């Protein structure tokens, strides 16, 4: 049930229901220097696969691994659980006539800082009545985790750990931290504890007292979710900081209890700083 599947341009590829005698697919690459891609599905008489997919209010896709039409589109999945924030709207769609040939061209563009904090992968394509498919395989690229000002947002890769350090101090009393709303906080009573260990890993957490670092501590400071969507941002009052510089990590998971890890070194400086004594 192949259909005949032809490059047109980077991250731009057209399927026609000629039956292909071996199945070829195409692989698209989104990150920011190349946000957008172009499904082109020609009409002999032109539907992107799953169908419905990129009409619909709740954007769907087929899984990574779907075998063919009817397995993609009987467990069809959906684009925010991929890319948090998805709409239909990034979809655009055209019908294009060219020397007696229809086609229908979808050509979907991600917003750069939507992109998400790891990289994912689906699928979508073309479909026909008669279950004939073209693949075309989605690479989503990652957000690089990065600290801006007092924002910290978590990324994660599957070579290593990712680490990120921040500063907190009386005068600079808070920070926000960003897990993704796909993803998990380590550890998960980070409202009341840290990881005295080297990682956030549960193995190596060592969980211990935020007591440790903090006067008067109170979980009330913590507001939002790691895995929210604006992060959980903490807000030190100025009689909470110590005397002594102290620092504690706390951070993310990809999954609830495994790795990827992104691990934050919060840095807290001690009051008074010196010049002030």
Not at 146 to 159: A, D
């Amino acid at each position: 049930y192949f259909g005949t599947l032809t490059q047109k341009a980077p991250n731009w590829y057209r399927c026609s229901s000629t039956r292909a005698k071996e199945e070829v697919v195409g692989h698209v690459t989104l990150n920011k220097e190349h946000p957008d891609m172009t499904i082109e599905c020609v009409d002999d008489g032109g539907e992107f696969l799953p169908l419905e997919g990129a009409r619909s209010s709740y954007p769907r896709v087929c899984h990574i691994d779907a075998k063919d039409q009817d397995d993609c589109e009987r467990n069809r999945g959906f684009l925010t659980d991929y890319i948090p924030g998805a709409k239909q709207y990034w979809y655009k769609i055209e019908k294009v006539e060219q020397n007696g040939e229809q086609s229908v061209l979808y050509k979907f563009t991600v917003p750069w800082i939507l992109l998400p904090p790891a990289k994912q992968r689906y699928k979508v394509g073309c479909r026909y009545p008669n279950h004939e498919y073209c693949f075309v395989e989605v690479t989503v690229e990652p957000t690089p985790p990065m600290v801006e000002g007092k924002r910290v947002t978590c990324g994660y890769s599957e070579s290593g750990p990712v680490n990120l350090e921040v500063d907190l101090s009386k005068n600079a009393n808070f920070i926000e931290i960003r897990c993704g709303e796909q993803h998990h906080p380590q550890p998960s009573t980070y409202t009341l504890q840290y990881c005295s260990g080297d990682s956030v890993d549960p193995q190596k957490c060592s969980p211990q007292s935020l007591t440790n670092i903090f006067y008067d501590y109170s979980s009330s400071w913590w507001k939002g979710k790691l895995n929210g969507p604006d992060g959980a941002t903490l807000t030190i009052p100025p009689g909470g900081f110590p005397e002594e510089d102290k620092s504690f990590l706390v951070g993310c998971s990809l999954t609830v209890d495994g790795p990827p890890f992104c691990n934050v070194k919060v840095r807290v400086a001690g009051n008074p700083a010196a010049a002030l004594v």
